Design an enzyme around this catalytic site. Sequence first.
Site, PDB file in Angstrom:
ATOM      1  N   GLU A  33     -10.090  -0.131   6.975  1.00 33.71           N
ATOM      2  CA  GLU A  33     -10.260  -0.165   5.526  1.00 33.71           C
ATOM      3  C   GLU A  33     -10.116  -1.592   5.050  1.00 33.71           C
ATOM      4  OE1 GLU A  33     -10.763   0.229   1.574  1.00 33.71           O
ATOM      5  OE2 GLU A  33      -8.842  -0.563   2.190  1.00 33.71           O
TER       6      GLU A  33
ATOM      7  N   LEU B  47       0.828  -1.222   0.000  1.00 32.21           N
ATOM      8  CA  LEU B  47       0.000   0.000   0.000  1.00 32.21           C
ATOM      9  C   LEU B  47       0.865   1.276   0.000  1.00 32.21           C
ATOM     10  CD1 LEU B  47      -2.422  -1.181   3.023  1.00 32.21           C
ATOM     11  CD2 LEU B  47      -2.822  -1.195   0.482  1.00 32.21           C
TER      12      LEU B  47
HETATM   13  C1  LIG Z   1      -6.608  -6.175  -2.103  1.00 31.18           C
HETATM   14  C2  LIG Z   1      -6.959  -5.077  -1.062  1.00 31.18           C
HETATM   15  C3  LIG Z   1      -6.325  -5.003   0.151  1.00 31.18           C
HETATM   16  S1  LIG Z   1      -5.136  -6.111   0.938  1.00 31.18           S
HETATM   17  C4  LIG Z   1      -3.582  -5.530   0.518  1.00 31.18           C
HETATM   18  C5  LIG Z   1      -2.562  -5.627   1.518  1.00 31.18           C
HETATM   19  C6  LIG Z   1      -1.257  -5.161   1.209  1.00 31.18           C
HETATM   20  C7  LIG Z   1      -0.968  -4.675  -0.051  1.00 31.18           C
HETATM   21  C8  LIG Z   1      -1.964  -4.630  -1.062  1.00 31.18           C
HETATM   22  O1  LIG Z   1      -1.737  -4.240  -2.358  1.00 31.18           O
HETATM   23  C9  LIG Z   1      -1.833  -2.920  -2.828  1.00 31.18           C
HETATM   24  F1  LIG Z   1      -1.137  -2.110  -2.149  1.00 31.18           F
HETATM   25  F2  LIG Z   1      -3.113  -2.494  -2.824  1.00 31.18           F
HETATM   26  C10 LIG Z   1      -3.527  -2.269  -4.247  1.00 31.18           C
HETATM   27  C11 LIG Z   1      -4.897  -2.335  -4.081  1.00 31.18           C
HETATM   28  C12 LIG Z   1      -5.632  -1.261  -3.545  1.00 31.18           C
HETATM   29  N1  LIG Z   1      -4.955  -0.171  -3.139  1.00 31.18           N
HETATM   30  O2  LIG Z   1      -6.830  -1.424  -3.428  1.00 31.18           O
HETATM   31  C13 LIG Z   1      -5.570  -3.513  -4.609  1.00 31.18           C
HETATM   32  C14 LIG Z   1      -4.735  -4.519  -5.162  1.00 31.18           C
HETATM   33  C15 LIG Z   1      -3.347  -4.453  -5.381  1.00 31.18           C
HETATM   34  N2  LIG Z   1      -2.756  -3.281  -4.804  1.00 31.18           N
HETATM   35  C16 LIG Z   1      -1.323  -2.909  -4.935  1.00 31.18           C
HETATM   36  O3  LIG Z   1      -1.255  -2.564  -6.324  1.00 31.18           O
HETATM   37  C17 LIG Z   1      -0.114  -3.346  -6.919  1.00 31.18           C
HETATM   38  C18 LIG Z   1      -0.495  -4.670  -7.712  1.00 31.18           C
HETATM   39  O4  LIG Z   1       0.062  -4.315  -8.906  1.00 31.18           O
HETATM   40  P1  LIG Z   1      -0.072  -4.504 -10.414  1.00 31.18           P
HETATM   41  O5  LIG Z   1       1.241  -4.339 -11.084  1.00 31.18           O
HETATM   42  O6  LIG Z   1      -1.207  -3.728 -10.897  1.00 31.18           O
HETATM   43  O7  LIG Z   1      -0.371  -6.113 -10.466  1.00 31.18           O
HETATM   44  P2  LIG Z   1      -1.367  -7.333 -10.821  1.00 31.18           P
HETATM   45  O8  LIG Z   1      -2.427  -7.080 -11.796  1.00 31.18           O
HETATM   46  O9  LIG Z   1      -1.839  -7.865  -9.557  1.00 31.18           O
HETATM   47  O10 LIG Z   1      -0.279  -8.266 -11.393  1.00 31.18           O
HETATM   48  C19 LIG Z   1       0.310  -8.241 -12.685  1.00 31.18           C
HETATM   49  C20 LIG Z   1       0.651  -9.707 -13.085  1.00 31.18           C
HETATM   50  O11 LIG Z   1      -0.557 -10.607 -13.071  1.00 31.18           O
HETATM   51  C21 LIG Z   1      -0.687 -11.251 -14.335  1.00 31.18           C
HETATM   52  N3  LIG Z   1      -1.877 -10.633 -14.961  1.00 31.18           N
HETATM   53  C22 LIG Z   1      -2.450  -9.434 -14.604  1.00 31.18           C
HETATM   54  N4  LIG Z   1      -3.534  -9.351 -15.446  1.00 31.18           N
HETATM   55  C23 LIG Z   1      -3.730 -10.465 -16.169  1.00 31.18           C
HETATM   56  C24 LIG Z   1      -2.653 -11.286 -15.857  1.00 31.18           C
HETATM   57  N5  LIG Z   1      -2.417 -12.546 -16.345  1.00 31.18           N
HETATM   58  C25 LIG Z   1      -3.353 -12.936 -17.217  1.00 31.18           C
HETATM   59  N6  LIG Z   1      -4.414 -12.126 -17.551  1.00 31.18           N
HETATM   60  C26 LIG Z   1      -4.659 -10.904 -17.080  1.00 31.18           C
HETATM   61  N7  LIG Z   1      -5.810 -10.241 -17.470  1.00 31.18           N
HETATM   62  C27 LIG Z   1       0.648 -10.937 -15.081  1.00 31.18           C
HETATM   63  O12 LIG Z   1       1.514 -11.856 -14.615  1.00 31.18           O
HETATM   64  P3  LIG Z   1       2.187 -12.868 -15.616  1.00 31.18           P
HETATM   65  O13 LIG Z   1       2.623 -13.963 -14.700  1.00 31.18           O
HETATM   66  O14 LIG Z   1       1.379 -13.286 -16.796  1.00 31.18           O
HETATM   67  O15 LIG Z   1       3.429 -12.115 -16.024  1.00 31.18           O
HETATM   68  C28 LIG Z   1       1.113  -9.565 -14.517  1.00 31.18           C
HETATM   69  O16 LIG Z   1       2.625  -9.408 -14.519  1.00 31.18           O
HETATM   70  C29 LIG Z   1       0.723  -3.704  -5.721  1.00 31.18           C
HETATM   71  O17 LIG Z   1       1.539  -2.581  -5.143  1.00 31.18           O
HETATM   72  C30 LIG Z   1      -0.354  -4.010  -4.704  1.00 31.18           C
HETATM   73  O18 LIG Z   1       0.112  -3.849  -3.314  1.00 31.18           O
HETATM   74  F3  LIG Z   1      -1.360  -2.944  -4.097  1.00 31.18           F
HETATM   75  C31 LIG Z   1      -3.240  -5.067  -0.751  1.00 31.18           C
HETATM   76  S2  LIG Z   1      -6.811  -3.633   1.115  1.00 31.18           S
HETATM   77  C32 LIG Z   1      -8.052  -3.272  -0.049  1.00 31.18           C
HETATM   78  C33 LIG Z   1      -7.900  -4.076  -1.185  1.00 31.18           C
HETATM   79  C34 LIG Z   1      -8.779  -3.766  -2.233  1.00 31.18           C
HETATM   80  N8  LIG Z   1      -8.784  -4.424  -3.422  1.00 31.18           N
HETATM   81  N9  LIG Z   1      -9.716  -2.801  -2.110  1.00 31.18           N
HETATM   82  C35 LIG Z   1      -9.754  -2.110  -0.959  1.00 31.18           C
HETATM   83  N10 LIG Z   1     -10.703  -1.145  -0.860  1.00 31.18           N
HETATM   84  N11 LIG Z   1      -8.874  -2.247   0.058  1.00 31.18           N
END
Ligand SMILES: [C]C1=C(SC2=[C][C]=[C]C(O[C@]3(F)FC4=C(C([N])=O)[C][C]=[C]N4[C]4O[C]([C]OP([O])(=O)OP([O])(=O)O[C][C]5O[C](N6[C]=NC7=C6N=[C]N=C7[N])[C](OP([O])([O])=O)[C]5[O])[C]([O])[C@]4([O])F3)=[C]2)SC2=C1C([N])=NC([N])=N2
EC number: 1.5.1.3
Length: 186
Positions: free
Chosen positions: A30, A22
């Site tokens: 989340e 991330l």
């Molecule tokens: C899931 C979720 C969660 S748990 C987690 C924990 C730790 C880390 C992670 O991850 C991230 F940061 F986040 C993002 C997201 C958001 N922000 O939302 C979602 C998902 C993912 N992510 C990121 O971004 C990136 C991944 O990258 P890319 O470059 O765009 O890739 P992919 O598409 O997976 O791969 C490429 C490969 O595969 C294959 N392919 C594709 N396409 C296709 C294929 N094959 C066949 N066909 C088709 N159409 C290929 O392979 P080969 O073997 O053939 O060569 C290519 O190369 C990274 O940086 C990661 O990390 F990010 C996560 S917490 C949450 C979630 C969600 N979904 N939503 C909410 N609201 N939250």
Amino acid sequence: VGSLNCIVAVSQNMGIGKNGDLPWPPLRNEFRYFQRMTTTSSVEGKQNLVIMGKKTWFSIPEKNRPLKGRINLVLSRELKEPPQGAHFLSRSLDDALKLTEQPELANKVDMVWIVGGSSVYKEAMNHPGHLKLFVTRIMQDFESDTFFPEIDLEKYKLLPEYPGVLSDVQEEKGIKYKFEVYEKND
Ligand SMILES: [C]C1=C(SC2=[C][C]=[C]C(O[C@]3(F)FC4=C(C([N])=O)[C][C]=[C]N4[C]4O[C]([C]OP([O])(=O)OP([O])(=O)O[C][C]5O[C](N6[C]=NC7=C6N=[C]N=C7[N])[C](OP([O])([O])=O)[C]5[O])[C]([O])[C@]4([O])F3)=[C]2)SC2=C1C([N])=NC([N])=N2
């Protein structure tokens, strides 16, 4: 299979990650919000499915992987098999969504949650159909190396309220943030 959803937390400068972490210091509540929205199904006897890229998988702390009580699917064209702890592996977003058509999954899965990263978000967001974005606005700039794609507000309507989502400003560790839900249907 029910609704397709993306979920993300994003700083004011559109940052989502830096060096695999991330950009901001951990925000406990989340993450609890993420865990609650992705885990809760609206249908008895089903689980939700989380789809994520490979770097996202490895960015989640080990003690929280797989994401418990969800079917975990990782996207990669390099991997030969799902990573240790993961359940499924697909080579493309379409392949993964097709996989949820397979019979022994199509009756297991309620909601589909794309949980990162940038490239997976961008293809889902520009693909025609019904899609919701659950966006946490972290209300400061943070140095980032990976960014959330542009949200086209002509297509993505900001909902004025959503059940189960707080509307006021939150704060943890002196960082203010707010939850939003966007919906498109095209
Ligand atoms: C899931 C979720 C969660 S748990 C987690 C924990 C730790 C880390 C992670 O991850 C991230 F940061 F986040 C993002 C997201 C958001 N922000 O939302 C979602 C998902 C993912 N992510 C990121 O971004 C990136 C991944 O990258 P890319 O470059 O765009 O890739 P992919 O598409 O997976 O791969 C490429 C490969 O595969 C294959 N392919 C594709 N396409 C296709 C294929 N094959 C066949 N066909 C088709 N159409 C290929 O392979 P080969 O073997 O053939 O060569 C290519 O190369 C990274 O940086 C990661 O990390 F990010 C996560 S917490 C949450 C979630 C969600 N979904 N939503 C909410 N609201 N939250």
